[PDB]
Amino acid sequence: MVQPKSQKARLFITHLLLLLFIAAIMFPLLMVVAISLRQRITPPPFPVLLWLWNSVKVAGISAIGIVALSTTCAYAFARMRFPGKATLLKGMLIFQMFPAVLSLVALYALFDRLGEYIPFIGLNTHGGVIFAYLGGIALHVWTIKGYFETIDSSLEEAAALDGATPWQAFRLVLLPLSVPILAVVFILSFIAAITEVPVASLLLRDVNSYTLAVGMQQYLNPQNYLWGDFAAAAVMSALPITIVFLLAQRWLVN
């Protein structure tokens, strides 16, 4: 467009002030820099390395369960009409997006019961943790279905012609189509798992199978150059986050 009307004036003020903004909300990360020495005669320290590896084990399989469920269950919701569809979705949305406070209360009670009969998934474990998260589909089914419908119908119609039962029509035909969402859910599922805290903390007794989420928390008592080790952990933190946060960035298709 045209714009003689004091162009330079707005550009500088906008531009500069903009600079100030990033800079400030940057100092914090910056100091993290202002240290980074992980691994007289001292040694070992609280083992973040394994912590990180676990976070992946947690987040990875965690997401898989999320998508498997949000997608399959949702399938019934969008296409296959049935008894009371509008109301339940109505419910799951509201129902779950609760402030998971004391969600733990029942949880501890429940998992206690679980661990005894059904080993492994019980308290203190990887599998026990993933199971907890699963109820997260509610937000997702809503999105997974929403994209579903946007693609046009007939495509199925022609196919219905040539024998694609619900699944063949769904999988071969429909799903690879609706894959973009699969990633969205998968990636986002991945991040929450890592940025977990209440649940992971609670179930996971052991020192070893902590998540990166659990273990770095500790450096609260011995502040003062112990904290320094924490910066290093942050270093270990930027790798997964910077990377995966970044990969997803390209996704802004158009």
Binding site: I22, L29, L107, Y219, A234
Partner: protein
């Protein structure tokens, strides 16, 4: 209690299989909710998960609930200070997050300020690294004595104030922390949403003459209120009930100082809840019926309202 639930389900599952798949959803997600608010105390002063059945067991082989909630005034006093705080925390929090998100967004695509792309990646990062690792270093910065934080503070300016200590300054500690934690979500929602608007429209504005400021206030802003709302208020539901941020930065510390049970100034509603369950010391009062009930219920008021405005949407 578990014996009870599986009772109805067994009959239901075999009968209608379909039920079993759903059972897992209802059992894991839904069931805890039920016990959570319901069981939410009764006998459990700090002496009764079990019952007389077990009493036989302990002694032999040696060889109510919610009432607590409303029924208050004397006990019920710590609760009010936090509610006010917690609530206000969420409003002011949301208020700022957005002021930044949209304001930030507008400028991103102002076409003119070239290099929009680079500023974009950086503005986002707060979000990139977690909240978890992020806020921890945050505390470490914010030590009263320690932390390069006050360090520069005292250095350049006069003072170097009481982050953890004084309650007043402490509260502000969190608001801003979330500002840095929270603006990205507002930025991104706003960035994508702002897009929808008709480019030309602004051109209209051009003919009549105004902005960019007039653009923001007159045009775009009072035209992003509606889209934003289902989201902004709902997130607020979450903000109020922001358990995690509070815990690591400051267990509400400083303390309130009159608090019979495990209370605290900064301590949002949730924190208070969790503490008088645990957090050192046995059954101080392992029976948060009031705490449990209000939580599940008040938020729903938000849940229902969220649902009202939104409901799937446009093409615009």
């Amino acid at each position: 209690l578990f014996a009870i639930t599986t009772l109805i389900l067994s009959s239901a599952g075999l009968y209608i299989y379909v039920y079993p798949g759903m059972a897992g959803m209802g059992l894991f997600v839904l069931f805890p909710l039920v016990c959570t608010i319901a069981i939410a105390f009764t006998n459990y002063s700090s002496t009764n998960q079990l019952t007389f059945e077990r009493a036989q067991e302990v002694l032999l082989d040696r060889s109510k609930n919610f009432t607590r909630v409303f029924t208050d005034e004397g006990i019920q006093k710590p609760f009010l200070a936090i509610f006010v705080w917690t609530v206000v925390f969420s409003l002011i929090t949301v208020f700022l997050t957005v002021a930044v998100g949209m304001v930030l967004a507008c400028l991103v695509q102002w076409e003119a300020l070239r290099g929009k792309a680079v500023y974009r990646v950086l503005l986002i990062l707060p979000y990139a690294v977690p909240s978890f690792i992020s806020i921890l270093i945050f505390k470490g910065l914010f030590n009263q004595s320690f932390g390069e934080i006050n360090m520069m503070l005292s250095a350049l300016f006069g003072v170097k104030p009481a982050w953890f200590s004084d309650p007043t300054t402490a509260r502000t500690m969190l608001i801003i922390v979330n500002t840095w934690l929270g603006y990205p979500y507002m930025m991104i929602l706003c960035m994508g949403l702002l897009k929808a608007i008709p480019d030309d429209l602004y051109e209209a504005s051009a003919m009549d003459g105004a902005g960019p400021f007039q653009n923001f206030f007159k045009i775009t802003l009072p035209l992003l209120i509606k889209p934003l709302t289902p989201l902004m208020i709902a997130s607020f539901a979450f903000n109020f009930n922001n358990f995690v941020l509070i815990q690591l930065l400051t267990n509400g510390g400083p303390d309130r100082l009159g608090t019979t049970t495990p209370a605290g100034y900064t301590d949002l509603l949730v924190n208070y809840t969790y503490r008088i369950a645990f957090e050192g010391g046995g059954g101080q009062d392992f029976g948060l019926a009031a705490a449990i009930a209000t939580l599940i219920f008040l938020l729903v008021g938000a849940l229902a309202i969220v649902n009202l405005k939104a409901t799937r949407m446009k093409f615009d």
